[PDB]
């Protein structure tokens, strides 16, 4: 009985921590697990394509994926692994700095049995935050960085 669980949210909301919490619950009950992280985030098997780790993922019962927005094959990999009987758990940004869908990540939602959106704390007014605000001028989607480059931000502070 395979499965896809999706953990959405803005930056700084602890998506990776929730991912690991959920993975460790299985691990402690004797499940073989594998966590996959996006190689190019220079801030678990590193990968740039989920194809490149599919063989390793096949000999495991539970698959965790961090920063799933950055894998071009995220959708098809997850659906294929769940149909093969695996429990697939994905941590991912739902939105870019422009509050648009981050790549193909939202295509997982109609395929998933569980979907949640976490909240961060707004770094500018300290209320609840749902969005990621880019601090710089760069216009491309993929720009790797932490709190030096992005603020987790509420609606009002986003447009401030």
């Amino acid at each position: 009985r395979g499965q896809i669980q999706v953990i959405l949210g803005p930056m700084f909301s602890g998506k990776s921590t929730e991912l690991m919490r959920r993975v460790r619950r299985f691990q402690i009950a004797q499940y073989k697990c594998l966590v996959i992280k996006y190689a190019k985030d220079t801030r678990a098997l590193p990968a740039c394509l989920l194809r490149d780790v599919a063989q390793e993922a096949l000999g495991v019962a539970v698959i965790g994926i961090d920063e799933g927005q950055f894998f071009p094959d995220i959708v098809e990999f997850c659906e294929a692994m769940a149909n093969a009987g695996k429990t697939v758990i994905v941590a991912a940004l739902d939105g870019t700095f422009q509050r648009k869908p981050f790549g193909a990540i939202l295509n997982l939602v109609p395929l998933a049995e569980s979907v949640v959106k976490l909240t961060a704390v707004c770094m500018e007014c300290f209320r609840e935050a749902a969005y990621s605000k880019r601090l710089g001028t760069e216009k491309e989607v993929e720009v790797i960085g932490g709190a030096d480059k992005y603020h987790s931000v509420c609606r009002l502070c986003y447009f401030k």
Copy 2:
């Protein structure tokens, strides 16, 4: 402070019941409320475009939208109303009978402060259900109907 809350799930998961629970909480505390439903699901204003009813939503503090997937202008309405300081609560199918995004509904996710995906009971094996299965052979996306035309199903029963 305006916001968008999204209630996703398959058919028969009680999305519009959760919509009404959330709205009545504000109503009981003396908030002015408006609920919108899709005018063509026959089976509290009906509408085909949210544009047709937006001026009315302006005179209100809390807006509920049922079957949001059927509204082509769902994204711009919810985003504009939330930025005008309204609480917008949307019940909607995340996926079609083919487990694909239903209209533009998922473009709401990166704009939303709250997103949940509800769960139904699988009408075939009686485990937890995440999807909607069309029973007949019609090909088009919009086919109105209940349990005579659709089953809420788990992954395994979907692929039978």
Copy 3:
């Protein structure tokens, strides 16, 4: 394979609505369902003791209980029913007007596979509300009434003098 689910929260948080949402999910999939309500609240079987109703409950697959705080035998009934393979869903206040456990209701928590606490809207400042504030001066726990006798309130409004 039985179960207890507990829906907690203050007044006006829609606990009964969420109870019915969960029950109708099973009903629509052709489960036999029964809902039990507290009889001394006249603001779908009425009852004062769950014992009085246990045989009707034994004949269904899913049992809903509204205002579970008022039932002296809430703990033993839910446990007996869940062990007999029933799905038991309980709507109940967690706290009295004094923010104290309401009867034996919290004893369900260690017995339950699912527990949630819902939120209301504060009727005094309109932020999120977790508590039920009594408007009058009656001192007894059980006083039946709606928004004329109680406000859902946040922490600050609860303590406002």
Copy 4:
């Protein structure tokens, strides 16, 4: 503006991890934070304390207070309530139930006091379905016996009564 959040669940449900996830969201937004642990639980797997009163002074100088294994502090209710009323956010990870599936100390008295309450889930160590309970493996009868998976299984209803 003060708050009490409660994270319940059986053992192995990752309550401490969820506690740290919530606290770190505040810390990363430059809030002053304090995490308190039960001193007598020395397991491999944060100020140690046996009474929350003993760390009250440190807690007063902080905006966010995390409390791990809240069930073991006798003064859990009055500490959490006083700190929330003083405008602190207090987040508590705790067992709701003992090995007997009874209330664990005073922990449930927090529930009517709390604006947020959740019960987490574990995996059943005996049938691998969802687990809501903690089953003691040995014969000890006293409530407090410190241990991990060597002494307890997270367990579903059916496996509890086997």
